[PDB]
Amino acid sequence: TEILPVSMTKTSVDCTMYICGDSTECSNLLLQYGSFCTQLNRALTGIAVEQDKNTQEVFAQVKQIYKTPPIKDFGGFNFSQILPDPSKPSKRSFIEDLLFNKVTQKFNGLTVLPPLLTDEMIAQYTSALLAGTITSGWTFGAGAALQIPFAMQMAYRFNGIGVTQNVLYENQKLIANQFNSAIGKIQDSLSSTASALGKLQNVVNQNAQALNTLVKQLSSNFGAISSVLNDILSRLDPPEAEVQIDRLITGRLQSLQTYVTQQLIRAAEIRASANLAATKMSECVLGQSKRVDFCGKGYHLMSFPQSAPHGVVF
Amino acid sequence: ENQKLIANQFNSAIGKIQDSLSSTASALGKLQNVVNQNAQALNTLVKQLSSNFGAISSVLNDILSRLDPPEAEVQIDRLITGRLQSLQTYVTQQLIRAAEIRASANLAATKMSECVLGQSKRVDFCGKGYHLMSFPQSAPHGVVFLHVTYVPAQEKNFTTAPAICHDGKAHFPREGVFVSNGTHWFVTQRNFYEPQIITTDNTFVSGNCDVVIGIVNNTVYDP
Amino acid sequence: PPAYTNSFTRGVYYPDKVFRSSVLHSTQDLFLPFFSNVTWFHAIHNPVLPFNDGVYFASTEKSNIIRGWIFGTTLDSKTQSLLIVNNATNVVIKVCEFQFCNDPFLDVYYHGVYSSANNCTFEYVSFKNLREFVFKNIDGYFKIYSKHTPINLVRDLPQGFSALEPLVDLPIGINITRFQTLLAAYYVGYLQPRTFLLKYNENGTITDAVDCALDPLSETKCTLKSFTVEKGIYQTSNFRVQPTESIVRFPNITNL
Amino acid sequence: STNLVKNKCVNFNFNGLTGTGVLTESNKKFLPFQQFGRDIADTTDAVRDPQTLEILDITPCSFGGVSVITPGTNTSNQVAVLYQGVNCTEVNVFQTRAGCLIGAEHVNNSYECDIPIGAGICASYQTSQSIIAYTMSLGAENSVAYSNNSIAIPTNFTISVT
Numbered sequence A: 001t002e003i004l005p006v007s008m009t010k011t012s013v014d015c016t017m018y019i020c021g022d023s024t025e026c027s028n029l030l031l032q033y034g035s036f037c038t039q040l041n042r043a044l045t046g047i048a049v050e051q052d053k054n055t056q057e058v059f060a061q062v063k064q065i066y067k068t069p070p071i072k073d074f075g076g077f078n079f080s081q082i083l084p085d086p087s088k089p090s091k092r093s094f095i096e097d098l099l100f101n102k103v104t105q106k107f108n109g110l111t112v113l114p115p116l117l118t119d120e121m122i123a124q125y126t127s128a129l130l131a132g133t134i135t136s137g138w139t140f141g142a143g144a145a146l147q148i149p150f151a152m153q154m155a156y157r158f159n160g161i162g163v164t165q166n167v168l169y170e171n172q173k174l175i176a177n178q179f180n181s182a183i184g185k186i187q188d189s190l191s192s193t194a195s196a197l198g199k200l201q202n203v204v205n206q207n208a209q210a211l212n213t214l215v216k217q218l219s220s221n222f223g224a225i226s227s228v229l230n231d232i233l234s235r236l237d238p239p240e241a242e243v244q245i246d247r248l249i250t251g252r253l254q255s256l257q258t259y260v261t262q263q264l265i266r267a268a269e270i271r272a273s274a275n276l277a278a279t280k281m282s283e284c285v286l287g288q289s290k291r292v293d294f295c296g297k298g299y300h301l302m303s304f305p306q307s308a309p310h311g312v313v314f
Numbered sequence B: 001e002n003q004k005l006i007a008n009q010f011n012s013a014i015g016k017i018q019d020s021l022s023s024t025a026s027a028l029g030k031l032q033n034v035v036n037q038n039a040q041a042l043n044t045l046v047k048q049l050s051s052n053f054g055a056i057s058s059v060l061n062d063i064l065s066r067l068d069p070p071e072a073e074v075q076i077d078r079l080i081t082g083r084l085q086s087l088q089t090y091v092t093q094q095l096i097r098a099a100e101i102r103a104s105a106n107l108a109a110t111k112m113s114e115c116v117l118g119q120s121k122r123v124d125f126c127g128k129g130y131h132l133m134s135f136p137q138s139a140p141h142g143v144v145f146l147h148v149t150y151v152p153a154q155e156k157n158f159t160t161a162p163a164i165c166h167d168g169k170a171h172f173p174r175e176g177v178f179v180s181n182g183t184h185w186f187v188t189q190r191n192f193y194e195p196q197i198i199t200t201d202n203t204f205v206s207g208n209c210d211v212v213i214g215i216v217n218n219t220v221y222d223p
Numbered sequence C: 001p002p003a004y005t006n007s008f009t010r011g012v013y014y015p016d017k018v019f020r021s022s023v024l025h026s027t028q029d030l031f032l033p034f035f036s037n038v039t040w041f042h043a044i045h046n047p048v049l050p051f052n053d054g055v056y057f058a059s060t061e062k063s064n065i066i067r068g069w070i071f072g073t074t075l076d077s078k079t080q081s082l083l084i085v086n087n088a089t090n091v092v093i094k095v096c097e098f099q100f101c102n103d104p105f106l107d108v109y110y111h112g113v114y115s116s117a118n119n120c121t122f123e124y125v126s127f128k129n130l131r132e133f134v135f136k137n138i139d140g141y142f143k144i145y146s147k148h149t150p151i152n153l154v155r156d157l158p159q160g161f162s163a164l165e166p167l168v169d170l171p172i173g174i175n176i177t178r179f180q181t182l183l184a185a186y187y188v189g190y191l192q193p194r195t196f197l198l199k200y201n202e203n204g205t206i207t208d209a210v211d212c213a214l215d216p217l218s219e220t221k222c223t224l225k226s227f228t229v230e231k232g233i234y235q236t237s238n239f240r241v242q243p244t245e246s247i248v249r250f251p252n253i254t255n256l
Numbered sequence D: 001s002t003n004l005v006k007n008k009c010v011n012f013n014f015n016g017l018t019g020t021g022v023l024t025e026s027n028k029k030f031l032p033f034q035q036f037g038r039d040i041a042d043t044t045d046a047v048r049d050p051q052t053l054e055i056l057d058i059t060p061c062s063f064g065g066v067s068v069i070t071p072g073t074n075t076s077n078q079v080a081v082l083y084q085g086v087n088c089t090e091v092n093v094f095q096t097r098a099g100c101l102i103g104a105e106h107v108n109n110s111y112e113c114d115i116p117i118g119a120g121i122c123a124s125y126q127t128s129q130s131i132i133a134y135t136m137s138l139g140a141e142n143s144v145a146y147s148n149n150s151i152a153i154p155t156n157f158t159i160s161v162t
C-alpha cells in the first residue's frame, strides 16, 4: 500500500487582512511596500490553482465517469472493500472510510479555499478510475474504454512482468484468495498500525504546523513593543507608533514571505509527488508500469487508487 | 495497409495546429505564462526601485539633497535593506521557478530520448494515447512537441474465452484475446480488430480444461 | 427641478504632461465618476454650488453667452475672487474684489457690471461646438482643461469618448470650497477620488478609459490592467462585514 | 454593559477581552472557575457572558474575497460575483458550498465544466442566454457493460497529433 500526497491545503492567505485589519496606520505603512503583498497573493493563488491542476492530472485522467454494474462476476476477486458502497450517504468505499478515519477554523488571516473537486467528486473519480481498471482494463486512458473481462485482463497483465498468462487460468482460486487475504491484512494494519499512511500524516502534519506556525507568528513580538496593533495604536503617539508598526510589518511580512517560500518549496515537492502519482496511475493503474521498484517491491500487476484526504493511496 | 490514410490524419492534425495557434490564445498557455512570469518578475523587480520601503522617498539623490548625511545615511540604509530583501525574494523565486523549469527540462529531455529518440512506453507521458513519435519545435524560453499518438475510435462488442480445448488440451492466446464475430472465433490484438484463424501457431497448451474459468469448447484448424 | 441624465464616458483628462505610448497606465486622482447624475441648469427667472473635491463644467454656447465665473469661499469683499472674461477672443483673469448687491447678476434680459476694487493680487490676460472646462485646485494650482468637438446634436450628450487636454496653470494657492457661474444648455458635474485604466494609442491619444469600481467587469479590468478580459474567474479584492456598533460587557450591581 | 446580540457580526469587550466576530449559542460546558474558551491555535473560541453563565461561540465575521466570474468580451459582457465561503445571509442569489454566488441561477441540469467556481460548482454563459452556476458533471455518466465473457475490441482508430 503505497501512500502519496497529491494536493495540499489550498490556503490563499489574504496578506492585507492578515497583517493590517481595521488599522489605518498599518494600511498606510504597508502601502509603502507595495508589490510585496500583491506578489504574495499572486504566488499563493498560483499555488491554489496548482493543487487543482495536480488533482485533475491525477484523478481526472478519465473522460467519462464509469459505473460498475451491480452484478460483479469477477471470477474470484472480491472488490467490495474498495468499490463504493451505496449504503453510505457519500459513496466512499470501506477502505477509503478507514483512510479518512485514520487521518485527522480558517479565521485568523488564512481563509482556506475549498477544493474545486470536493471529497465526493474525488471519490467519484477514484471509483471511475477503478471501474475502468476492472471493466475496461487500461485502454480507458489511451482512447475510449473497452469492455474486457477481469480474468482476460490478466491475459496481458501477467505478460507485463514476464509471467505467462496461464498462471491465472491455472491458479485463479488461490490468487483471488491471496489478494483478498492481503487486502484484509491492509484493513487490519490501517485499523491498528498508524505508520502505514505515514506519508499522508506527514504531508497533513507539516501543513498543520505550517498553518499553526504562521498564525502564531501573529503572536510573536518580532522586536516590537508587543504584537497587538490595536494596543500600539491606542497607546503610542504616532511618531513612535509608526516606527513600531514598521517593525511589525517588517517582521510579519518576512514571516509570511518565509511561509510562502517554504510553501513554494513544499508545493514543488508535492508537485513532484503529484506527477509521480500521475505517472503511477498512467503507467501503473491505466496500464502496467515496467519501472522496477516503482509501484512497490516486486513485479507489479495493477494498482487501485483510493482517495485519501490531501493525497491518494495506491 | 493504410499508410496514405495515416498521412492524411497526420497532415490534418498539422493543419489543425495552425488553427489552434491562431484562434486560441491559450494553446501555448504554458510557454506564454512562463514568458509572462519572467516578464512581471523583472517588472516588479523594477518597481521595487520605486517602492519607498519605509524610506522618505525612492530617490537617493533626493534624500541626500534634502537632509544632512547623518540622517540620510540611515534613510539609504533602510531603503537599501528593502532593495536587498526584494532582490533576495526575486532570486529565491527565480531559484524555485528555475527548479520547476529544470524539472520540465529533464522531462523534455526524457521525452526526446524516449519519445523523439525512441518510443516512450510511459502512458500519458507523450500525450493521451499510444504514442508514436514527437517533433521538437523550439519557441523562445521553451520547446514544443508534436506528440503523434494512436487513439482507437470505433468499437464492436464480441464474445471472449481464455482457453480452447479441441482434443482436451487447453489453448491460450500468445497475444490478443480470443474473439468471435458470432459464428466463428478469431484472435486479434487489443488495439485494432484483425482476426486470425485459431491455429496451434498462436496458441500454447497449458493444463487441462476444467481448471480454466470461462473456457469454451472450440474447433482448432489443423495446418 | 433639475433633470438628471447619464454622463456616459465624459470627464477624462490628461493628468500630467508625461507622454506614454501604447500603454494601459492606470491612475487615481480627483475624477468625475462614470454614469453619475448631472445637475442640468438653465436661466429662468444663479446659486452657489459646492466646489467639493473638483468641479466639472460643460456648456453649449453657439452665441457665446456663458463666459464668466465668480469663485471663492466667503465673498465678503475680503477674499480674492476668480473672474474670467472672454471678450474679443481674449482670455482675461483677475482676482479683484468688489461689493455685492442683493441680487448680483449681469445685464442679460434677452439680448457687464464691475465697480472699484479693494485688494488685487493676480493679473493675467491671454450645438456646433461643445466646450468642456473642468475646474480643480491641486497643490494650490487652479487648472483648466478644454476640448471643442464639432457635433450635430443638442438634446443630450453623445455616446462616445474624448479626452480633455489642458490650457493654463493658475497658481492661486488659495483654498476654494464654493463657486458660482455667471450667464443655452450647460451641465455641471462633480469630481471624486475615482480610479481609471487609461489607454494610450500609438500616438499617445487616450482612445478609451474605464472606471475601476463601476461594475464587477470594471473592477476585473482595473485589476488586470487590460481592456480585453478573457474567460475565467478573477479574484479582484476582498470584502469585510463591519461590526454593527459595539458590545461592552462588565460585571455590575453585585450585592448592594 | 448595554445589550448583547447574537448572530450579527459586532465588536465585543468581555472583561477586557476585545476583538471582532459574531456570538452564537454553544453547547460547550464550562467549569465554574473557567471563564473563556480557547482553540488549538491559541485563538479565542467560546466566551461566557459574565452576567448570565451562558456559553457563546466566537466566529469569523465573513472574510472571503470577491471573485468575478465573467465570460470573455468576445462572447458576452455580463458578470457573476462569487463571495468566497460566506453564508448568503449578510450578502438571483444561489448559495454554494464555495461561497455566496450572485448573478447566476442554479441549473438543475449538469453539464461539462467551463469556468470552475469551487466545491464542484461551475459557471457558463450558454444555456436569452445568461450566466449560470450548476453542479459539475465530469463527462457523460457512462456505464460500460462489464461482462462475464464479452469484449469490445476496436475495429478502427485515429492518429492525432497533440
Ligand SMILES: *[C@@H]1O[C@H](CO)[C@@H](O[C@@H]2O[C@H](CO)[C@@H](O)[C@H](O)[C@H]2NC(C)=O)[C@H](O)[C@H]1NC(C)=O
Pocket: A078, A079, A080, A081
Ligand atoms: C466480499 O467480502 C465482504 C467483506 O468485506 C463480504 O461481506 C461480508 O463478509 C462477511 C464475512 O463472513 C459476512 O459475515 C457478512 O455477512 C458479509 N456482508 C456484509 C458485512 O454486509 C462479502 O460477502 C464478500 N463477497 C464475496 C463474493 O466474496
Ligand SMILES: *[C@@H]1O[C@H](CO)[C@@H](O[C@@H]2O[C@H](CO)[C@@H](O)[C@H](O)[C@H]2NC(C)=O)[C@H](O)[C@H]1NC(C)=O
Pocket: B005, D155, D156, D157
Ligand atoms: C476507418 O475510418 C476511416 C475514416 O476515418 C475510413 O476511411 C474511409 O475509407 C473509405 C474507403 O474504405 C473512403 O471512401 C472514405 O472517404 C474514408 N473516410 C474519410 C473520412 O476519408 C476507413 O475505411 C475505416 N476503416 C475501416 C476498416 O473501417
Ligand SMILES: *[C@@H]1O[C@H](CO)[C@@H](O)[C@H](O)[C@H]1NC(C)=O
Pocket: B157, D145, D150
Ligand atoms: C452489442 O451491440 C449492439 C449494438 O449496440 C446491441 O444491439 C447488442 O445488444 C449488444 N450486445 C451485447 C451483448 O451487449
Ligand SMILES: *[C@@H]1O[C@H](CO)[C@@H](O)[C@H](O)[C@H]1NC(C)=O
Pocket: B181, B182, B183, B184
Ligand atoms: C463470421 O466470419 C465468418 C468468416 O468466414 C463468416 O463465414 C460468418 O458469416 C461471420 N459471421 C458473422 C455473424 O459475422
Ligand SMILES: *[C@@H]1O[C@H](CO)[C@@H](O)[C@H](O)[C@H]1NC(C)=O
Pocket: A073, B213, B214, B215, B216, D148, D149
Ligand atoms: C460465466 O461463464 C462461465 C463459462 O464457463 C460459466 O461457467 C459461468 O456460469 C458464467 N457465470 C455467469 C455469472 O454468467
Ligand SMILES: *[C@@H]1O[C@H](CO)[C@@H](O)[C@H](O)[C@H]1NC(C)=O
Pocket: B168, B216, B217
Ligand atoms: C466440451 O466438450 C467436451 C468433449 O470432450 C465435453 O465433455 C464437455 O462437457 C464440453 N463442455 C462444454 C461447456 O460444452
Ligand SMILES: *[C@@H]1O[C@H](CO)[C@@H](O)[C@H](O)[C@H]1NC(C)=O
Pocket: C201, C202, C203
Ligand atoms: C498617428 O499619426 C500618424 C500620422 O502619420 C497616422 O498615420 C496614424 O494613423 C496615427 N495613429 C492612429 C492610431 O491614428
Ligand SMILES: *[C@@H]1O[C@H](CO)[C@@H](O)[C@H](O)[C@H]1NC(C)=O
Pocket: D074, D075
Ligand atoms: C472569438 O472571436 C472570433 C472573431 O470573430 C470568433 O470567430 C470566435 O468564434 C470567438 N470565440 C468563440 C469561442 O466564439
Ligand SMILES: *[C@@H]1O[C@H](CO)[C@@H](O)[C@H](O)[C@H]1NC(C)=O
Pocket: D087, D088, D089
Ligand atoms: C445560513 O444561516 C442560516 C441561519 O440564518 C442557517 O440555517 C444556514 O444553515 C446557514 N447556511 C449554511 C450554508 O450553513
